[PDB]
Amino acid sequence: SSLLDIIYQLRQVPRWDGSFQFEKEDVSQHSFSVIAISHILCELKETLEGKKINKEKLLLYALYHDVTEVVSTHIISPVKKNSILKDPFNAFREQIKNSLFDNLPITLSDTLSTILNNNDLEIQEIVEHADHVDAYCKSCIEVHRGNKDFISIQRSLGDKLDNLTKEYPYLKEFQNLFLKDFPLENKNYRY
């Protein structure tokens, strides 16, 4: 099986191609953050919208969200979302999904196929929102480090986030809890 190799190979898939970064980010670092953000968003949404989400399925979907990038590499969203490329790349992503875990024990292979092909629209939406939050957070950290090339990126992502918070109360709450002062300049909790 290639499953464990793929989990570690995600460290070789860089994000933010075409942008200068003070800290290079790989898909594994990004995915760790997205799992944590997805969890927090889920807890806020459950309390706000009076429900219980299947957190096992959500966390697993966040965990493997970007696993197909071990084949596709990470195509930055200004490229991937071009009208010329949007639908072709989604078709490519589907071809990758269908071939990835080709050599597993069937109880395990079905569980992985279940995650990658999850048709739960709400779980898909939470992780998409988490992905946007994480990209915004990275842009905040780069600007904090002094990276002026990320100012316009932070502005674009922050504008979209602001528009999202008008339609999704759990995102507005997340923004109020964590994104108005991010990153923390003084790491008081270390001491």
Add this chain to the structure above:
Amino acid sequence: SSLLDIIYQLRQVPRWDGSFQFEKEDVSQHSFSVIAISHILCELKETLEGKKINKEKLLLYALYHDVTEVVSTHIISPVKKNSILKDPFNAFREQIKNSLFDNLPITLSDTLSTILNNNDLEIQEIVEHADHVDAYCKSCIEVHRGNKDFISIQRSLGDKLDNLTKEYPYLKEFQNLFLKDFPLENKNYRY
């Protein structure tokens, strides 16, 4: 709240201090791998030992397993497990846990306290096993890159893993599925 800052600050906590690495590893990369390994181990154990584990609680425990290292830094196990330091460092880790999420909404703060203070012995044990698997995997990748300084590390971790597989059938199955050929020299799944 410091929660989101801490999630990203884990990228500044290096592992393997005192060892030459071809690839520097941080706690966020390691934690991503441990979440995935914990999931796989859980699925194997459920099928082998005829049970169902609360995977939400397991995945959350793996996700925040090392969060106190944002305060303690990552103390390598040959140091942390010295008889002089073993119990003091565990007491330190407990003091950190008690102070970490000091400024959260109570529904969220209780959920985080619930994770960090989880007294589920089986979940604790799965993640401890996942931690050992991940450390072994890292040592395999370093040796694969040509890092002779990791040969003795790989030998030590592999010896302990082998002894563990004699007592835990789900670990023996994991080893048979993934660890006999790791990492993959030819990344066929990319093509």
